Enzyme design. Structure first.
Site, PDB file in Angstrom:
ATOM      1  N   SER A   1      -3.946  -5.388  -0.314  1.00  0.00           N
ATOM      2  CA  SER A   1      -2.572  -5.847  -0.366  1.00  0.00           C
ATOM      3  C   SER A   1      -2.414  -6.943  -1.382  1.00  0.00           C
ATOM      4  CB  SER A   1      -2.111  -6.363   0.998  1.00  0.00           C
TER       5      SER A   1
ATOM      6  N   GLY B   1       7.811  -5.750   1.391  1.00  0.00           N
ATOM      7  CA  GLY B   1       8.876  -5.757   2.355  1.00  0.00           C
ATOM      8  C   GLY B   1       8.582  -6.331   3.641  1.00  0.00           C
TER       9      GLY B   1
ATOM     10  N   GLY C   1       0.812  -1.198   0.000  1.00  0.00           N
ATOM     11  CA  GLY C   1       0.000   0.000   0.000  1.00  0.00           C
ATOM     12  C   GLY C   1       0.842   1.242   0.000  1.00  0.00           C
TER      13      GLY C   1
ATOM     14  N   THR D   1       3.114  -0.007  -7.112  1.00  0.00           N
ATOM     15  CA  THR D   1       2.496  -0.428  -8.353  1.00  0.00           C
ATOM     16  C   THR D   1       2.161   0.822  -9.102  1.00  0.00           C
TER      17      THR D   1
END
Lengths: 774, 367, 307
Positions: free
Chosen positions: A199, A449, A150, A154
């Protein structure tokens, strides 16, 4: 001198030191008198003299630490400069709203071909640098975008791909397919987690191919890591995949009656976790009454700024006709997804004639008729394939399975169909941008991550294990390669060794003695146990510094966990406890040979297209270890670029900076550790354009007309600074310890003497006019 | 923070945080090493299973109760009891809680020292107190006067307390109950052909000591009605399918508390130790020791006590004196509900031994 | 308020009156146990008809301490603890009845989106009588906390205003009453911290509570003994019959008779699984393992410090 004091709410606040002694640093806050607390040496960090400054490069700071780096990002968040160069790593902060002109095509045309540091840091300044390395060293470049889910990895990936298909030409006839396809594949792979509502539970890797003429030839998108376990079991605050809630809340009544679909609470694979839909006030009344489950009636919709399940189903079916997917083939894609749902409704029992055998329950007869109609198989041949172990003596006999192995076989057959279904969707999309003769290529990784929760399981151990292997890649590409570059530029710099994480790798994936080498051996054992697997980690590795037991932990939560309920692995990003419940079940992915001669042998043409004596159980953890080490070979063989995306607040709103969560994203990404090894013999190193802006204010207007390559070489010659303490580079000035702070006091001292030395070096430039010209 | 009440039962070790409802952990104290060869080799088997897992693994181990006649067998097994209790039952670190331990009223020195000392050096509790189980049963009963009958496996006790002082010369310790009642029950069940001879199988005997036993009102007259054809015989079912019918022996075993001649020990019954301890107390106080006769422990849960105890005491006790025998339900947890009330009361936090003072003092002054 | 709901309000008030007519005695099989008197059988039939409970399930709930081993056993209570449980059950019903009446009235003037608000307090001032008890000590303790509020809002804030208007005025310090606060409600050593500990003690005593105030605070200037008082009335009171707290409004002697009984508000878990479990719809609407006795004086100290 004021320092940075740990504050609970702000993370770091300004404050002086008014009493000092071992572990007794008395810190008075600045402008808040009275609240004088004590600290420890490892919690206090020095601060910069000037508070009005903000630097594009953070190696242009005088006192480099985590608090002076979090203050430079807090000031540049206030001044709306989200893109910030930290050494060779782009740090990007998500603003969560559109900032004017930074994504403009006039901005993209400006940046084109310009050198780094000459123009301010931007997303397209990293993509331009990794296009000139295609002509210099001639090596394929991998863009690796990191950060918590988030964080914009992307959306910033779509900005990088738009710059490459514009700045360096066109390439493709239709650009927009690459951009548009991403929300389509995120319908299938996105889920809901405790950390973020939207997510991704998959690691996509875009491979944009080019050629020797330097033109685009097409692309190829793949995927690594899929949470197969999520299909079978979901957390309390988690959903499953976001395509199943878009099929039960989106699809018509002349589609739901044809697929025999009921509400999510009736299906085993959807009744474990959260069944609530993401909807807004207007959409809540649009969703049909029969689609609303009792839990949705009681607890209502889930709220998000971006997601709407019924809205995203319209933009799913629009994106299907834009990749060329026929509506008759979309109905067969809905029959495969609904067949996984009615596969989970099959329940087993014991019987027999075999006496040991496995049979089905009475409630599983109506569910087996609707499941075999969607799959395209016979009911009798599927009932003796879920319950038997077929073997041969070449006749070919059948041997009934156990009940726990039947429940694991039905769940493994459901995960096997979704595996080949996810590869079929990316193969349909890759066919809309085919490539021909390639040589060079630019890859773009998008993987999450270090995401840690309060309750951590197997999939959080696969994410943290993949992060420890990627961080060992970052330690040999950001720290090892960089100090090879200091010895290539004439700087020299004595080698500083880094702390390796190789000991964690030879704990999790070590041969014979590793954790995955005991987890995959537990599933092969007759009567597997979670208590036997937990004691086998502490029995095999009794002494390892990275491993700890729940009672050895100081965190309270861990104090409730029992010895046979979990184990603590210390990682580079922190110490994470992993519970051992259902770990063995999640490591089961056994593909029975009788089910292989059934799914292949289906009577439906779509299933045939989807699927187009060793080893017993096959391995799940070593299936993923094979696909992780294969992606490591694609990273060690390519030139990498490092982008880190920082989330400023949990609300996901503009102009809000929490300071405590952002600090944890600097500590759970190696940022503090890379900015301590890199400091070495030249802690401050600033570019000619950065030293022109920071020191032109101390110069008169007339003298400030000079270019920064001449202004920095005339100010260095005018002062006459020693080359061993102040090293003058090609485009930067490298300062030894304590000498950038001493140079700042040169410029803030005697203006008449400095203007006289500028006059003297100007006289030397009049004399050195012809020497250079031959 | 919160204090932990851990009662060193001889049964039946009991453990639970300070109030307000019931103990968190209760277990049958057994440690057992594996007596057969493993053949499956697995492996993963433990060196010694504690209870409850050692009661799910009967017949593959040799059960050893660690406290026998009030003496701890060795602190190697005792420390494993403690470690098992705090870690794998309660789920608590000893550095987080001041603890409360219990002992017997009369027990040899240095059994409380060596215990206290080992628990301070091994588990490193920040503060500790050791209370006798009888005093805690008075706090639980809510009386400040009376003779306390604390009867558990394998040490029973008889303590007289008067508002709120104790008389040292009148405290009586009987080693009569309860493991000897178990062993006697095993000796008179062999008399009816039920060969329960092994250590593990003694737990099954204990279960028939709980459930099937009862007590007579008068021995001689119950022996009379035993000669009759009436159904004193009750049929128990055994884990391997066997049906055991015990009748006469069913009331015979508890009667041992009134007649230790059945076991053959020289000591006199609870009847007479009650009277002989009361008649070692001063004349005026005897008036209020009668009618504050308080029973406690798990082995007093046989059905015919206390009204057997009542009728028998009333026969030996002075005439026209009112006698009431206080016996509430829940007597097995009496001690624990005592301890809960004790460690929760201010100011008796300052009657705990603290680690800093203990570091200087050692085993001295504890006692 | 409907007349049919007013009749259920009259059934709850009358059920508290026939709760007090239940009298206990001792028995048993338990031998220590508590039972009821013969005169309490006709009163228990009329009490269980108003409350909406079964008579047998209310008789073994007023007389036992329910606990579990998870079976769920029952352990008979003492006679003094039975009389304190019946009186605590009567005070528990009137507590939720008073909150139900203000909730019915607050529903006749509901509010929507608010920001500013004007509060109006109405509480009595230092009311002292010739005979003072626990409730007069709760009124004078609430007055000493309100007067310390008036000393930091009428004297402290006002002299901040003299320095805001250009007047300047040198600061004059006031005499604080904080020493009385750290006498009545002090942690561990306060009077309410000894009164709530007395109720937890087995066999509570009024002589033990009176001597514990003078044993714990032997030297405090705000505290005095009846023989140190000059008023005649106080001269008739004995050392173990009361204690004198000097307040900002004067020196008030408080008798220690029934202080401990008044500090008992124990809510037994078996009675909670009875009043909640009532068969009457009105009682259900009214009521819409720690801590043993719960605390009464620190229940009120929580609601006083919240105000």
């Amino acid at each position: 001198k004021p320092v940075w004091a740990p504050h609970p709410t702000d993370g770091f606040q300004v404050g002086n030191i008014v009493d000092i002694g071992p572990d007794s640093l008395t810190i008075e806050p600045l402008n808040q008198k009275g609240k004088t607390f004590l600290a420890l040496i490892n919690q206090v960090f020095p601060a910069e003299e000037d508070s009005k400054k903000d630097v594009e490069d953070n190696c242009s700071l005088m006192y480099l630490n985590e608090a002076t780096l979090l203050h430079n990002i807090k000031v540049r968040y206030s001044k709306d400069r989200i893109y910030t160069y930290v050494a060779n790593i782009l740090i990007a902060v998500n603003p969560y709203f559109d900032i004017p002109k930074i994504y403009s095509s006039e901005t993209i045309k400006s940046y084109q071909g310009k050198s780094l540091g000459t123009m301010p840091p931007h997303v397209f300044a990293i993509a331009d640098k990794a296009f000139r390395d295609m002509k210099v060293l001639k090596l394929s470049q991998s863009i690796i975008v990191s950060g918590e889910s988030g964080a914009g990895k992307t959306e910033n990936t779509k900005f990088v791909l738009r710059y490459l298909t514009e700045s360096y030409g066109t390439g493709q006839d239709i650009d927009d397919r690459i951009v548009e396809a991403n929300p389509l594949l995120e319908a299938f792979g996105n889920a809901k987690t405790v950390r973020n509502n939207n997510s991704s539970r998959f690691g996509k890797f875009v491979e944009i191919h080019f050629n020797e003429k330097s033109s685009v030839v097409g692309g190829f998108v793949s995927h690594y890591l899929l949470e197969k376990s999520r299909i079978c079991v979901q957390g309390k605050e988690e959903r499953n995949y976001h395509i199943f809630y878009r099929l039960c809340a989106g699809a018509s009544e002349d589609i739901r009656e044809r697929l025999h679909l009921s509400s999510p609470d009736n299906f085993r694979y959807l009744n474990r976790g959260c069944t609530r839909y993401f909807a807004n006030k207007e959409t809540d009344k649009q969703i049909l009454q029969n689609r609303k489950s009792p839990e949705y009636l009681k607890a209502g919709s889930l709220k998000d700024p971006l997601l709407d399940d019924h809205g995203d189903f319209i933009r799913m079916c629009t994106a299907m006709k834009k990749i060329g997917l026929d509506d008759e083939e979309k109905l067969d894609l809905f029959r495969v997804v609904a067949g996984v749902l009615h596969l989970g409704n099959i329940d087993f029992e014991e019987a027999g004639s075999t006496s040991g055998g496995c049979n089905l329950k009475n409630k599983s007869t109506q569910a087996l008729e609707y499941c075999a109609e969607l799959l395209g198989l016979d009911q009798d041949d599927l009932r003796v394939s879920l319950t038997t172990r077929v073997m041969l003596t070449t006749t070919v006999i059948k041997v009934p399975l156990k009940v726990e192995q039947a429940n694991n076989a039905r769940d493994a057959l459901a995960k096997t169909v979704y595996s080949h279904l996810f590869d079929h969707v990316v193969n349909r999309v890759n066919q809309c941008f085919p490539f021909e003769t390639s040589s060079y290529f630019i890859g773009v990784l998008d993987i999450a991550g270090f995401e840690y929760f309060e309750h951590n399981s197997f999939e959080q151990f696969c994410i943290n294990y993949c992060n420890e292997k990627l961080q060992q890649f970052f330690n040999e590409r950001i720290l090892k390669e960089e100090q090879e570059l200091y010895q290539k530029e004439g700087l020299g710099v004595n080698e500083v060794h880094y702390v390796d994480n190789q000991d964690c790798i030879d704990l999790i994936e070590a041969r014979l003695v590793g954790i995955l080498d005991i987890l995959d051996e537990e599933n092969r054992l007759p009567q597997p146990s979670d208590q036997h697997f937990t004691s086998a980690v502490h029995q095999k590795h009794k002494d390892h510094f990275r491993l700890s037991i729940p009672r050895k932990s100081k965190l309270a939560i861990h104090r409730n966990i029992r010895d046979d309920e979990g184990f603590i692995i210390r990682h580079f990003a922190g110490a994470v406890c992993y519970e051992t419940t259902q770990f063995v079940e999640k490591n089961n992915d056994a593909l029975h040979m009788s089910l292989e001669s059934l799914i292949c042998e289906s009577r439906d043409k779509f299933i045939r297209e989807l699927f187009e004596g060793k080893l017993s159980f096959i391995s799940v953890g070593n299936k993923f270890k094979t696909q992780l080490n294969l992606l490591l070979d694609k990273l060690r063989s390519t030139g990498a670029s490092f982008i880190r995306c920082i989330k400023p607040n949990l609300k996901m709103t503009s102009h809000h900076f929490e300071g405590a969560q952002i600090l944890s994203q600097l500590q759970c990404s190696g940022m503090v550790s890379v900015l301590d090894l890199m400091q070495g013999g030249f802690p401050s190193r600033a570019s000619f354009h950065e030293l022109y802006n920071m020191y032109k204010k101390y110069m008169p207007d007339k003298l400030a007309r000079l270019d920064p390559r001449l202004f920095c070489k005339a100010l260095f010659k005018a002062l006459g600074l020693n080359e061993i303490d102040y090293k003058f580079g090609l485009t930067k000035v490298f300062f030894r310890p304590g000498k950038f702070a001493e140079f700042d006091q040169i410029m803030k001292s005697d203006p008449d003497h400095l203007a006289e030395l500028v006059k003297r070096v100007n006289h030397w430039l009049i004399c050195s006019r012809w020497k250079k010209v031959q | 923070t919160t204090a932990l009440v851990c009662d060193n039962g001889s049964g039946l070790v009991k453990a639970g945080f300070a109030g307000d409802d019931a103990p968190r952990a209760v277990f049958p104290s057994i440690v057992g090493r594996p007596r057969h060869q493993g053949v499956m080799v697995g492996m993963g088997q433990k060196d010694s299973y504690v209870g409850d897992e050692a009661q799910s693994k009967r017949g593959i181990l040799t059960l050893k109760y660690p406290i026998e006649h009030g003496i701890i067998t060795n602190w190697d097994d005792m420390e494993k009891i403690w470690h098992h209790t705090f870690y794998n039952e309660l789920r608590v670190a000893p550095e987080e809680h001041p603890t409360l331990l219990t002992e017997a009223p009369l027990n040899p020195k240095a059994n409380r020292e060596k215990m206290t000392q080992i628990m301070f050096e091994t588990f490193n509790v920040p503060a500790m107190y050791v209370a006798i189980q009888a005093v805690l049963s008075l706090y639980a009963s809510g009386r400040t006067t009376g003779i306390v009958l604390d009867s558990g496996d394998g040490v029973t006790h008889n303590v007289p307390i008067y508002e709120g002082y104790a008389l040292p010369h009148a405290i009586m310790r009987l080693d009569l109950a309860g493991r000897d009642l178990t062993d006697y029950l095993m000796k008179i069940l062999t008399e009816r052909g039920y060969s329960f001879v092994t250590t593990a199988e003694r737990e099954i005997v204990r279960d028939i000591k709980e459930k099937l036993c009862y007590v007579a009102l008068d021995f001689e007259n119950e022996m009379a009605t035993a000669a009759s054809s009436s159904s004193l015989e009750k049929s128990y079912e055994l884990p391997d399918g066997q049906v055991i019918t015990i009748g006469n022996e069913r009331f015979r075993c508890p009667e041992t508390l009134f007649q230790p001649s059945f076991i053959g020990m020289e000591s006199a019954g609870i009847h007479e130790t009650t009277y002989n301890s009361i008649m070692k107390c001063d004349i005026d106080i005897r008036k209020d020791l009668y009618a504050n006769n308080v029973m406690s422990g798990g082995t007093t849960m046989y059905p015919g006590i206390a009204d057997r105890m009542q009728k028998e005491i009333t026969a030996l006790a002075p005439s026209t004196m009112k006698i009431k025998i206080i016996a509430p339900p829940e007597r097995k947890y009496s001690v624990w509900i005592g301890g809960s009330i004790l460690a929760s009361l201010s100011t008796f936090q300052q009657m705990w031994i603290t680690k800093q003072e203990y570091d200087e003092a050692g085993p001295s002054i504890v006692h």
